[PDB]
Design a protein around this ligand. Sequence first.
Ligand code: ZN
Ligand code: ZN
Ligand code: ZN
Ligand code: ZN
Ligand code: ZN
Lengths: 258, 191, 243, 380
Amino acid sequence: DELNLLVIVVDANPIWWGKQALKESQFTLSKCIDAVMVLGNSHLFMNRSNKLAVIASHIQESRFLYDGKYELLTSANEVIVEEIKDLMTKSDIKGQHTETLLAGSLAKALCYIHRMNKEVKDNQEMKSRILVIKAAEDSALQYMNFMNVIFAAQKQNILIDACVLDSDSGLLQQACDITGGLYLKVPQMPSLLQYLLWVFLPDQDQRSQLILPPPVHVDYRAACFCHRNLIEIGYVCSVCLSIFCNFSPICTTCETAF
Amino acid sequence: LEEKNRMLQEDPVLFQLYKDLVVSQVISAEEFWANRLATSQDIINSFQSIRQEMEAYTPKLTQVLSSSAASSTITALSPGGALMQGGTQQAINQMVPNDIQSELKHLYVAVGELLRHFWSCFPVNTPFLEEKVVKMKSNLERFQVTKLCPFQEKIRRQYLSTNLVSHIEEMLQTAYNKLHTWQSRRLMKKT
Amino acid sequence: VCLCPMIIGRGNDQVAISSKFETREDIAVIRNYGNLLLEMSAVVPDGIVAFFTSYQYMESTVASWYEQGILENIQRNKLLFIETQDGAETSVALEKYQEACENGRGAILLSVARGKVSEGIDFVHHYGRAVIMFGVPYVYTQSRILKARLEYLRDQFQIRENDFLTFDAMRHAAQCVGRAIRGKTDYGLMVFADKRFARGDKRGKLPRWIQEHLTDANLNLTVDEGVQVAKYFLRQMAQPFHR
Amino acid sequence: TKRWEGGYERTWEILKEDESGSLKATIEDILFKAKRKRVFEHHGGVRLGMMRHLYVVVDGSRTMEDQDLKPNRLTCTLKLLEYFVEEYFDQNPISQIGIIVTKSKRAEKLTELSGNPRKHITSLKKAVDMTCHGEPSLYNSLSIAMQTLKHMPGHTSREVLIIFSSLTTCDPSNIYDLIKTLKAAKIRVSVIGLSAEVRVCTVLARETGGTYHVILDESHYKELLTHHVSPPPASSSSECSLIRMGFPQHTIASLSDQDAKPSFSMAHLDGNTEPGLTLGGYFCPQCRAKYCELPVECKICGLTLVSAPHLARSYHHLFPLDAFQEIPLEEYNGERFCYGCQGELKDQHVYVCAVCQNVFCVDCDVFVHDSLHCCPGCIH
Ligand SMILES: [Zn+2]
Ligand SMILES: [Zn+2]
Ligand SMILES: [Zn+2]
Ligand SMILES: [Zn+2]
Ligand SMILES: [Zn+2]
């Protein structure tokens, strides 16, 4: 009767993976996809009632990615491979946009979790958690949407786990801190799957039983309204609580509201 | 005089602070009482390269993980590892004995009071406050020389691994940098 | 219900507090009268009006309270104001009483039922929220004037001597106690510190607009029971309503 | 006439059959009528707010010993005050709370005006075991509150809450002059009595612009406190009110790195027990002072430390999401898959955003308009 839903958000930003491939490093996007598929198969093998969802983010949008081995796992892997191949082959750079649309993927994941919750029988509770792997740099332009997503996830009690590969993201740290999730930075990319099989694999009840690394130093720098950049000290309005980097005779937001 | 003596006797911490700040000539008594009162087309080339590389992609099983990598990850995730540092101030409650801890708390209180006076003076909008900030800086330097240097010597003699002095040094350096920046801006405004 | 009339019989010591002529000098009854006013002064705020049978009984009442360590307890709760025969002294006493009830200090107005101040002023809302009758006010039978009227009505209009005295006693008692309700929004508390009021022959002498609100449940309840009724009534009468 | 004296209502007449089995389809509409029962707004009231400096006056006379509320008035009052402080700090990010206790015809400032909830809760818990003596003095408490709030900036809303248990107050001077002074000073005063209505409190509430209430039961007391929790509405633009406040990042320390810098929290120094010299915590952006609780104004430089998520949580009120247009499925020409949950659109109505022109089902529309507060399509 214990229903566990795992949603894996994969940062498939073409620029970062292209740079990694040009670096000729030991880790590639193919290995990351294989590790994600193995983690999903392990999660499904943990319990029959467990459900899996995979969403891949891109500059364009978010795509729902979902012979000796399990038949259902074979079909799931084939579907994931077909979806990722379709997304990558049809991915055409049309515009100057480069930041990953991480907020949209999280919103779609929350919508999918909400949809699945209603279909769940009343006698069972569907415990849901979201795992995010970060490859490219964080986007500061989507601060408000990211915070809204964090608050929505906290309202429904949905864990958010962050697995940073190269560049640490403050937004992911804040999400993990607020939602109670786990934030972890990968020291060695080729060993990534092992971490996925050691830290994020157990459920929240199982995490209490086991011993986990302490949370990293979470930052709480805000984003200025007129700059959309991280700041430490700024001017905050006393009415709409808007944050400004520099003093202004009149609040722009308050002037907007009539 | 009698009122000052009574006030000092009432609070032993205040008496100790007055002894450390006035008897050691760190600050004058008058000031103490007054205070009390992107790139080129290389990105597109990389995008095309990764698109072509992942266009012909096949799943792998053996290449995903290796025994050495798994063992290294387990060792790192084992207690006492890099990600599982088990020290985390193991005996901080018993390290740096409370006799030193009381002195550290007194120094923290003194630094907090002096920096509170400094930040209350800031910003300097009148010529009167210009000399007061200089006096506060001189008092801070005298307090540092009088207390922190013997404190650092005592720590070195007892060989404490805790970086207790680091926080005080950071606060003093931040205050000095802020004062230097404000003085430079004041000089620039006169140019 | 803008009024909560009730009749208090025996006190907390299960002793009647009737203002009988033979029991005026009794120490047991006079203690209960002060005891009744003690907790009453702390439940109804900003104005209590108390009427006594006569000045002679009034001056002896406060003297007993002053002699004991009881009157001082009332002083710290509310200011004690005594109405005298002098008009000028009464006016200033009323003047300070009005401002005392205006703020939160509170005051107690002590007077006589058959006095010029009983009907000369009207206790509008927020003034005199509680009216206390210390015994049935009976006119003095001396001076050989009332008895002459009683004899004339006896053989001419066949008027019962006891009934006329009861009629006169209740008329003045009901007239003064009825001055605490002036206006639809006005409300007040009405008490009777005498077991003689509880008898049917005197309850029927109350006006019909007070009879229906005088429930038979509270006709002989003690001082402590009367306080609880007063607390419950005043607590629920402060809520907002509609016109 | 009377509404029920006419014809009897037949509610079952609504259902009809034309093809002998169409009734099911009708109940489907009932299912569609089951949802969308809200106004798509969790509050639907005041969409803005303003900083409040609220002072709570607590009676300490013998009347608090009365057993109207179990066990006594003082204990229930302090418990409900703790609940009120918690809720008020939850719903007000940059508000301040002061506590004044009146006893023996005097007023004592029990707790300083600050935004720390734990300090106020600890002070109230300590005051639980106090001694009730003397009589209250509203004049002294009001004078202290006015003296404290006179120097506060005008843009801040100055509010005073008085819990008056005893029905008598001793004023060393005239109180109506103080009421006029408070009215001239633009201060809000609210009184919640316990025993009965008091004329002076009603006059004070009427002239000062506040509200006066009388407690019926503990539930009514809690309802009154919850009503007082809600911030008063504010104008669109009042003045140039801005405050410089810091955002202390929670930078912990580890022995693995070379930046393991233990420090003592400023708040914990005044504690009787040994202050917690943990690995790290919240460091002031201005003077690097260490604190363990937020929101706490910095003791050294006077800077205000506020948590960014707390401020950001109220941003959805500033920019509410416009309701999507209800379009029937037949009249819509496009994909029949939801943009949010990727589910097939089989409902009688499909909601389309007016900006990104995406399609969302009923469940996704409700989730966006109630919890997400942002359109997923507009994000891209
Ligand atoms: Zn700005
Ligand atoms: Zn504003
Ligand atoms: Zn600071
Ligand atoms: Zn949907
Ligand atoms: Zn939209």
